[model samples]
Target: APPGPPASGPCADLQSAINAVTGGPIAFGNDGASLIPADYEILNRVADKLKACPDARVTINGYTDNTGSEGINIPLSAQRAKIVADYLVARGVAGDHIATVGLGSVNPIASNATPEGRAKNRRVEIVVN
Candidate 1:
């Protein structure tokens, strides 16, 4: 059956806020885990939304392009997720409410054969539940 309008609540609001900023996935530089300065704005908004929803649980999933070996990609992807999680924790979001994982090229939204496609694959995604 068709559902009614999307759930309206604190958690939903937080999800909406995240989607608004992320569009799809948060982009990262090749071989880098550091976030660009502009990304902080998105993080700030996310932190505020999370702080407002005490019971919300969010997952941070990190991914990487297939340019490197799994050994390098895995930890690099984990670092990317950790960096975002740490940022939110530093901004007052409860650490216990967040979970992180490194998918490490397991799911690529675009082909890894082109630079633009590889760029799209190098990203971190957030999910709220």
Candidate 2:
């Protein structure tokens, strides 16, 4: 089969690349604040795109499952967001162009009632504009 064509559109490629990798928001390990190996390629694309579009503003939002108290959850989520932001900075994306947020146990895309749901809830979302 022929290789698929690269995605084309205004600021669509990065999110498309991310969707191709994980289907939606990037997942995190339970109680962990580190980027999984699979997330690197997606982030690399994000950083490259942002560097190409110097005026882009990017936000990295981190979330957590309801397993922990807000005090712990908040900092953990912040750590998660900061780590991704740091990675982008290391990859040449401008620090000033990115903002990080830790919305612990808030706006979960999935329920906190099951392992699968909790796993999905533990995620970092990237937004670009």
Candidate 3:
């Protein structure tokens, strides 16, 4: 469900704020968050969004499907988050304003029963405040 608007100050719903600015989610590889040629456009949009909010703080949540054990997947998820966060920092966003998490195979938006569903589980979600 959609969260209600911020009662005051900055946007309370980070997901909604990012979606409005960046359009929507950007897909990563099977177990990768490294940039591809196609990723530039979408990531740039997100950068723009961050730039708009000079004082904005963001949480970069990296999630993976249930393809690997927690030990392997956890580190992979953290690396993925770092990659995205690094991109933003390089794009001029302040590093201090960014926070990241590697949520390996924890919270999934789709079923892990199929390849297609698993693909949906591997992604970086952004939250702005």
Candidate 4:
């Protein structure tokens, strides 16, 4: 369950809410890729709140582990972000309602020396902006 009562009626406003499900310390996947199931579930869970606040839009940022060359990761991150963003749009959020960016491996919360740490760094933050 969520740690505590959400700061707002809907948990969608906080990047942490999305991070708890996506970018937390947990390694949801090996390469920072979030599959369609995760995308659907997350959006469905947040849709009510997003719909409730028409002015609220979330920015999906894609990141990558230092497993590959920066050139490869850069595009890969974009692809991942687009994939999730598209899924949200398909789920009812308008195409123009969502924004996404692929920042590659510029930032890292972990050392990226281990598989797990690298995986943790390769993530996406859904920020309400």
Candidate 5:
């Protein structure tokens, strides 16, 4: 059951605002929050590209399965992305160049009723512009 309007950002329902980001790995994570290890590599590349462009942003997104509570999954997803962001920051990517957000279990990769679907539900996203 979707949590409805009481939640913040895209947590309860996958909001369309996030759906419109510039470039995507959108389906894997939330529309705008995630940060996996490999994602750091992606962001750094985006950041490098931005050095030429100047006005650019790489957003990291996160996702999870509905099997858990939003309370737990939200933070868990956030930490997953943060780990990647922290790595990039350590490696010299300006913190301002990246944005991190977690959508918790709001977006389902596959049907929650099946193991494969639920398994795919846990993921991160990288969007560059």
Candidate 6:
């Protein structure tokens, strides 16, 4: 069961409500939050699923590779987070149900020592909380 009050609405089944966003065939444009067509399609699918549970909320966490100073990376991360959130909102997801955070070069899933690692580190992830 989901950790919250019993879901008692159209989207009452918590499991059916929110779906956590995870790794996939997703990537962004170089140095920006612009997702390609294929990745945007993935996000659209995620947003569509979120719409099923009106009461569910999501957290869009943005991260970056260690390519720039924290000064540059932090706001960049925030921008990336907002970018995804904006897409979700435009697709009819409630803005109030979504929160954003920028963790620039802080919690990397891969190393910054290589090109592929850096590419993997720069990303946005969604969590249903």
Measured by lDDT, the strongest candidate is 1
Candidate 2, superposed: residue stretches over 4 Å from native: 1-23
Cα lDDT tens digits, model 3, 26-117, are 55654345557566666677776787676778888787778689898888778778887888888778888889998898867877787667
Order of the predicted models by lDDT, top scorer first? 1, 2, 3, 6, 4, 5
Clashes of each: 0, 0, 0, 0, 7, 0
| Candidate 4 lDDT score relative to the true structure | 0.67
Specify the poorest-scoring 10-residue window by lDDT in model 3: 6-15
lDDT against the true structure, each candidate: 0.81, 0.77, 0.74, 0.67, 0.59, 0.73
Evaluated with TM-score, which candidate comes out highest? 1
For candidate 5, the per-residue lDDT at 57 reads: 56
- lDDT score at residue 103, model 1, on the 0-100 scale: 91
Instruction: Record all residue pairs in model 4 with backbone atoms less than 3 Å apart, i.e. clashing.
Output: none
Cα lDDT of candidate 2 equals: 0.77
Error of 6 at 105 (Å): 0.9
lDDT of 4 by residue, 1-129 (tens): 669665555644455565555534223365356564655676675554455566678777877777688789889778767876777776677766689898887867767778777667776656778
Deviating ranges (above 4 Å) for candidate 6? 1-26, 29-32
Tens-place lDDT digits, model 6, residues 68-129 = 89899989889888888888888889999889998888957877777667767877777777
CA lDDT of 82 in candidate 3?
Answer: 84
Where is model 2 poorest over a 10-residue stretch in terms of lDDT?
A: 14-23
- Which parts of model 5 have CA positions greater than 4 angstroms off? 1-54, 112-116
